[PDB]
Design a protein around this ligand. Structure first.
Ligand code: SAH
Lengths: 265, 265
């Protein structure tokens, strides 16, 4: 009669909360989805071993089309867990699943875990200064999406930072790198000429957040566009005007050039 | 020797990540602060029992003025942990403490935990649609803060949601309720008259996120301003223009008036 939405956190199998782990262990059935994002620092086997339960992985279609036929039936007469990378319900499509549960007469509870949305605090950038978020999508065929560029423009002109989630080919475990994202933005700039993203733009790259050794780097595009930030996942941030305290953290912790203390504050 | 900043999460001691618990358990000295937020579902005793170590609680003054004299000295020859509610670097000024650590020759690491900043996803509002955030601060004497009102205006103008962290006075055990926040906003509205926050404004209240049964309510200020949302902590959200699915969740899950289902595109 109960469905638990449990977040797995940022990077590896230990990023789940003690609460989520203990509840997961007592559930009769455990499902999981790895299409909204991936857990790059672990494997399904390591997660299974930690929880001590078989993990039934579900595809985007299984969830979007058949959640009520695959998960809810069992949740009706058993305690069921639905694991998701990060924090449950951050992914836009997750919330609606709680309505399906209600419609099926199934109780649902949410067990939170760290999300990249809040983990970016490790960049030294003030969380309240982040504006609207966006996703940099790979251009495909005759389709070249560019809305993420406008998001940066609108946030930056208000002195706000822009968090850019990078595209992922979940089914192929292929992550877009911050380098590729920078190349794409420079390409959109050349097409829109809004003076939003150029070689002189200050950016921040956060790689493998959650890991004990994430890569945190800040600098101008011209210098970071070909830098190696390590293994995925990568997150790209285009900060707005900085508070001196943010700038000093970027210089001391993220290796930003001293120049940002006078150009971007 | 090392210094770990470890988040304890949203509500109780089990909101810490498995990673954070594993590391905290093996540290030589454990410090913590409980003035940046309120964990309504636990006690110092239960947290101490979980990590198996005595926890030295520090006041805001101990931290801001003497972190380098109380904590860092030990981190030079021992493994030290510094615990905080939620995520240690979200809506706090703790990031600056990493700079103090560096200058003291002490390496520091960050272990994330569930944060209210991302937990708001449980309200059904799309996380990417949240704009700049703000804090509703208790007026002090003749000084009446109002910057948060302008933030709401700026976000709403762009169709974005506004997350409003509510004030806290730990040493005085004062935790601002959503009701008090609403009263303050109505007063600012009478003073500025921007039509930003009135009795007809739709708002969302999230109380005690992290617990299994948090209070999630949506409705007009006129109706919720005197409603009992339970014990603190509380957070208030002023949604921008709603997507149809957001409206559906607010009605089905947060008990919002069915009339909001009719979005004015
Ligand atoms: N469990 C919870 N439920 C509702 N609001 C919460 C909350 N935890 C924190 N807040 C809100 O945030 C304020 C503290 S701001 C510090 C937040 C913390 N670093 C984090 O990551 O969550 C509180 O006064 C309250 O308004």
């Amino acid at each position: 009669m109960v469905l638990y939405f449990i977040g797995l956190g940022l990077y590896d199998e230990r990023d789940i909360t003690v609460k989520g782990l203990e509840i997961a262990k007592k559930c009769d059935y455990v499902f999981a989805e790895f299409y909204t994002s991936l857990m790059a620092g672990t494997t399904l086997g390591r997660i299974q071993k930690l929880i001590g339960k078989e993990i039934r992985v579900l595809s985007r279609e299984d969830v979007e089309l058949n959640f009520e036929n695959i998960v809810l039936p069992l949740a009706k007469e058993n305690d069921v867990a639905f694991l998701t990378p990060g924090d449950p319900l951050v992914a836009t499509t997750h919330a609606e699943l709680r309505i399906r549960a209600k419609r099926a007469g199934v109780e649902s509870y949410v067990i939170h875990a760290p999300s990249i949305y809040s983990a970016v605090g490790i960049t030294g950038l003030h969380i309240y200064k982040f504006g609207k978020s966006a996703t940099v999508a790979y251009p495909n065929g005759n389709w070249f999406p560019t809305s993420y560029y406008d998001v940066i423009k609108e946030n930056a002109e208000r002195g706000l930072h822009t968090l850019l989630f990078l595209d992922i080919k979940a089914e192929k475990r292929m992550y877009m790198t911050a380098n590729e994202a920078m190349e794409l933005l420079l390409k959109v700039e050349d097409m829109k000429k809004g003076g939003v993203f150029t070689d002189d733009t200050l950016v921040v790259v956060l790689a493998r957040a959650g890991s004990l050794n994430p890569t945190i780097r800040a600098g101008y595009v011209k210098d970071l566009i070909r830098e190696d930030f390590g293994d995925p996942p990568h997150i790209l941030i285009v900060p707005g005007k900085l508070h001196i305290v943010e700038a000093e953290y970027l210089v001391e912790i993220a290796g930003a050039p001293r120049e940002i203390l006078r150009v971007n504050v």
